[PDB]
Design a protein around this nucleic acid. Sequence first.
DNA 1: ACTATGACGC
DNA 2: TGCGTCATA
Length: 422
Amino acid sequence: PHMATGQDRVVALVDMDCFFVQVEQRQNPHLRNKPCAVVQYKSWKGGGIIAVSYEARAFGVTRSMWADDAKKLCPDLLLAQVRESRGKANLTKYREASVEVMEIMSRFAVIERASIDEAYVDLTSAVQERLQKLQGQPISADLLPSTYIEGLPQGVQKEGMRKQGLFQWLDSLQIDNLTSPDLQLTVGAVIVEEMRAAIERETGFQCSAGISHNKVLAKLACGLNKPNRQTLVSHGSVPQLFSQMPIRKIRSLGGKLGASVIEILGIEYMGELTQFTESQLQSHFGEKNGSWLYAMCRGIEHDPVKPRQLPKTIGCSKNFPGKTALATREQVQWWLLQLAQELEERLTKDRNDNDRVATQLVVSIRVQGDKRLSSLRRCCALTRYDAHKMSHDAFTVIKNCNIQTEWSPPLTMLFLCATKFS
DNA sequence: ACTATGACGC
DNA sequence: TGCGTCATA
Ligand SMILES: Nc1ncnc2c1ncn2[C@H]1C[C@H](O)[C@@H](COP(=O)(O)NP(=O)(O)OP(=O)(O)O)O1
Ligand SMILES: Nc1ncnc2c1ncn2[C@H]1C[C@H](O)[C@@H](CO)O1
Ligand SMILES: [Co+2]
Ligand SMILES: [Mg+2]
Ligand SMILES: [Mg+2]
């Protein structure tokens, strides 16, 4: 139960299964229980894929691959596309579905919304209460209909394995020690089973969850048994789980830092970090990242679940590749205006719904020839929620950046974001 | 030339 | 602070 072994909390991560697909299926019943996908608003090669149904994943379909190329592998494949507005994607439908789920989770515990379809939950308090109200009654497997215990058992049919693993887990749980970490996780999974049932009952959406002692393990556990299932990862299962867990699959190590770890230490798996001393890790990744790595490879992490439901920023952007790159003043003014209008639309609802106002406008662009996501970013005061004014304010700041008569090189990206709410 | 939000260091 | 860079859905 110690902080020392990082078994001090019960944390869960809930993520909706093929979220965009499910949102479309709720509107159109005919799309249910059939292989389908959702492509971006642009139609070329059938459109880029962002969300794929599980039925369709069986045929090998993935996101980030062309729709028509996906078609060949799964000809039965049904397609849904993001509605278009002001020349760009319209995600209102999904954002609205997102709100539904979040309000339901917030009823069971305060949450930390981490993305449009997932949120972390700190269930530590709720678990104590459940242990109080239970009054010593045992936990039957019937309260965990969709739970997988990572690492078990030791020694369609897949359902048989799940229950056997679940039974050995339950048969070895502490009965008298209410502060037993494993027992705490188990109760946390019970609460999550209820939470997920409510989400489905009230919205029809299905999802998965991970229950463990920290955000990193909870997030990792969540992807272990998808879809419509939840996974419990105990501290004792970590050595085994990490023995062959690719380093880049761990939260915050999917990019350069993670690549750097693989490269500098000559390892591929999380479990291999264990052989290094904390000082070796600090001398190579820094005091802070070194200590974090030292503890994380042992299943220990302390980032707290921070209650957040409201976005810290609201923004939108658009890319204009190749021929399309924005060269003239007319072009840049118009697209800035389209973006600012979407911004105004969202900021308005934001103010109507949450009584806060953005005081700052951030403008970001990318000039043709630049490999980076964004070439530069600037900001200015956001006094009025007026799209025309904001468009001109944004234009003035990008005009300042730097051929004094047109844009050379041209812009391949425009970005507007409202922040500094108060 | 295949499309959002959040955090960190300084 | 404001900004470049990094992380990830
Ligand atoms: N790179 C991207 N660009 C645009 N939209 C994206 C995106 N990544 C995800 N989305 C949109 C599309 C998604 O529907 C949604 C959720 O992202 P996930 O949770 O990553 N993926 P899903 O829910 O689909 O499947 P499951 O979790 O079961 O694996 O956000
Ligand atoms: N690579 C990383 N990804 C995410 N968070 C990290 C990373 N390295 C250090 N930290 C954090 C965690 C601690 O709470 C804190 C140490 O005081 O800093
Ligand atoms: Co004007
Ligand atoms: Mg998802
Ligand atoms: Mg997600």
